[PDB]
Amino acid sequence: NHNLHITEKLEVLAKAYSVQGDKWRALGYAKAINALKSFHKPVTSYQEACSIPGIGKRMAEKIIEILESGHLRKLDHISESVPVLELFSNIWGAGTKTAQMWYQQGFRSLEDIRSQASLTTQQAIGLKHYSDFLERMPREEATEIEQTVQKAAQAFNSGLLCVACGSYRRGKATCGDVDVLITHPDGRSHRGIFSRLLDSLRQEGFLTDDLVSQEENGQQQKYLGVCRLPGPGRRHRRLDIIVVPYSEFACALLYFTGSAHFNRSMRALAKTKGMSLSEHALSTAVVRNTHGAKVGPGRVLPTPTEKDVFRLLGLPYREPAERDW
DNA sequence: CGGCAGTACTG
DNA sequence: CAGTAC
DNA sequence: GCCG
Ligand SMILES: O=c1ccn([C@H]2C[C@H](O)[C@@H](COP(=O)(O)NP(=O)(O)OP(=O)(O)O)O2)c(=O)[nH]1
Ligand SMILES: [Mg+2]
Ligand code: NA
Ligand code: NA
Ligand code: NA
Ligand code: NA
Ligand code: NA
């Protein structure tokens, strides 16, 4: 990370634009900051900047000011509202729109939110676990959680394949939450298991709150909730579970393993090749309009393994650790 | 000019 | 649907 | 914000 002074100044602006809802500008900063982080040498020329992909004149100028002026004047013109929008949007379930609305309504603190804001069920849970959801757990605990889910799953069907994905699979030392993918090699015994699984996990008091769980739908694909391991010193942890048909195992695994940036890059590439990649499948011959919107369903390509996805995209396979973008 | 990933819940 | 999220 |  030879462009540190540059990044921590840009990360400030990135977050500022993000919480304010200027999503694409924030994306631009995100990519540039990214490029900066994974680069070999400090940059010295505003020609040495434009060169780095993800950095144009606009961005270059700002790094220059960060090197020469040793500071970015833009940072001093950030709305005083940003810290509060950040505070608000860090409540699970509240995004930029809700944060801006609360701010516009005069709310400035979580105390204000707690006592006067109309919260959705999800936001109330997010607020209740505000600090907890901002904390990462040692990967070891993520193991205990994956194991807890797997145990409950395999309880009514030992054939069920359960695997922790996300940051865990990419080998990170700490995890923001636990992402568990569940499927079954017989390609059918995965149907309508959420009902049973979630119920057992609730019986033992493991699950404490549900955020997203359309259980009245037998086609439910994901469960997003909160759990807590037994014993003292335990914090509530975010738990995500997806149940996919074996036929989509590779794409689901690839998707759920991420990283998010990596997935988007993969999908953007697939798109340039007339293909479409999703958590369900990799498709080819996908018809699209001038707006890049899928007009034609295309054809689903066989992808029994992640390697296959990379291969079909003409990419060298990458271990999960090599996808931590 | 205009896309920037593709998808799944919630209310 | 807009919002939020993975 | 960047880039095709
Ligand atoms: O915008 C997103 C978010 C997530 N994902 C995929 C990739 C990601 O690794 C996976 C799980 O999402 P998390 O939000 O749980 N992120 P991750 O587990 O990588 O990191 P963290 O340790 O913060 O949870 O879902 C996307 O494709 N797009
Ligand atoms: Mg995760
Ligand atoms: Na470049
Ligand atoms: Na939020
Ligand atoms: Na969030
Ligand atoms: Na997650
Ligand atoms: Na529900």
Which residues, including other chains, have CB under 8 Å from residue A245's CB and lie 6 or more apart?
A183, A187, A188, A190
Domain-wise residue ranges, chain A: 1-81, 82-135, 136-258, 259-325
Asked whether strand C has any atom less than 7 Å from the CB of A236, the reply is: no
Residue A196's SS3 state is: helix
Orientation angle between helical segments A82-89 and A96-104, nearest 10 degrees: 130
Q: What tokens were used for A227? A: 């759990």
Query: Which nucleotides of chain B are near protein (any atom < 7 Å from a CB)?
Result: 2-11
Residue A81's SS3 state is: coil
Strands A282-284 and A222-227: unpaired
Q: Among residues A176, A145, A177, A174, which one has the least CA distance to residue A162?
A: A145
For A1-81, the fitting CATH number among 3.40.50.1980, 3.40.50.10470, 1.10.150.110, 1.10.10.10 is: 1.10.150.110
Q: Among residues A203, A163, A202, A166, which one has the least CA distance to residue A183?
A: A163
Ligand 1 pocket mutation, candidates A146, A167, A242, criterion most atoms within 8 A of CB: A167
CATH for A82-135?
Answer: 1.10.150.20
Q: Give the CB-side neighbour count of residue A129, counting CA atoms within 13 A.
A: 26
Runs of H (alpha helix) within chain A? 4-19, 23-37, 46-50, 57-67, 82-89, 96-104, 110-116, 121-128, 130-134, 139-156, 166-169, 194-203, 249-257, 260-272, 306-312
For A259-325, the fitting CATH number among 3.30.210.10, 3.60.15.10, 2.30.40.10, 2.30.29.30 is: 3.30.210.10
Q: Give the CB-side neighbour count of residue A96, counting CA atoms within 13 A.
A: 11
Residue A39's SS3 state is: coil
What is the residue whose two structure tokens read 């359960």?
Answer: A162
Calculate the angstrom distance between C1' of C1 and CA of A195: 28
Chain centroid, CA A255 distance in Å: 10
Q: What tokens were used for A194? A: 């959420």
Which residues, including other chains, have CB under 8 Å from residue A60's CB and lie 6 or more apart?
A46, A49, A50
Runs of H (alpha helix) within A135-206? 139-156, 166-169, 194-203
Query: A153 to each of A125, A159, A169, how far by Cα in Å?
Result: 25, 9, 19
Q: What is the DSSP letter of A300?
A: E
Q: Is A179 assigned a ligand-binding role in the annotation?
A: yes
Catalytic residue numbers of A?
62
Q: What tokens were used for A48? A: 């040495």
Q: What is the DSSP letter of A46?
A: H
Q: Is A176 assigned a ligand-binding role in the annotation?
A: yes
Calculate the angstrom distance between C1' of D3 and CA of A49: 15
Please tell me the experimental approach by which this structure was elucidated. Answer: X-ray
Q: A1-81 with A82-135: one CATH topology? A: yes
Q: What tokens were used for A58? A: 């606009």
Asked whether strand C has any atom less than 7 Å from the CB of A18, the reply is: no
CATH for A136-258?
Answer: 3.30.460.10
Q: Label residues A252-261 b or e (16+ Cβ within 10 Å = b).
A: bbbbbbbbee
Do residues A29 and A17 lie in contact, with contact meaning Cβ atoms separated by under 8 Å?
yes
What is the A178 CA–ligand 6 centroid distance (Å)?
A: 6
Q: What are phi and psi of A136, to 5 degrees?
A: -100, 155
Q: What tokens were used for A131? A: 């600090």
d(C-alpha A84, C-alpha A15), whole Å = 12
Number of residues that this document lists for chain A: 325
Ligand number with the minimum distance to the CA of A194: 7
Q: What tokens were used for A31? A: 């990519």
d(C-alpha A179, C-alpha A248), whole Å = 17
d(C-alpha A230, C-alpha A128), whole Å = 19
Q: Is A169 assigned a ligand-binding role in the annotation?
A: yes
Runs of H (alpha helix) within A177-321? 194-203, 249-257, 260-272, 306-312
Q: What are phi and psi of A209, to 5 degrees?
A: -155, 150
Which residues, including other chains, have CB under 8 Å from residue A93's CB and lie 6 or more apart?
A119, A120, A122, A123, A125, A126, A211
Q: Among residues A72, A10, A2, A65, which one has the least CA distance to residue A37?
A: A2
Q: Among residues A99, A145, A122, which one has the least CA distance to residue A224?
A: A122
Atom of ligand 1 nearest to the CA of A257: 9
Taking the C1' atom of every nucleotide in all shown strands and the CA of A25, the nearest one is D1
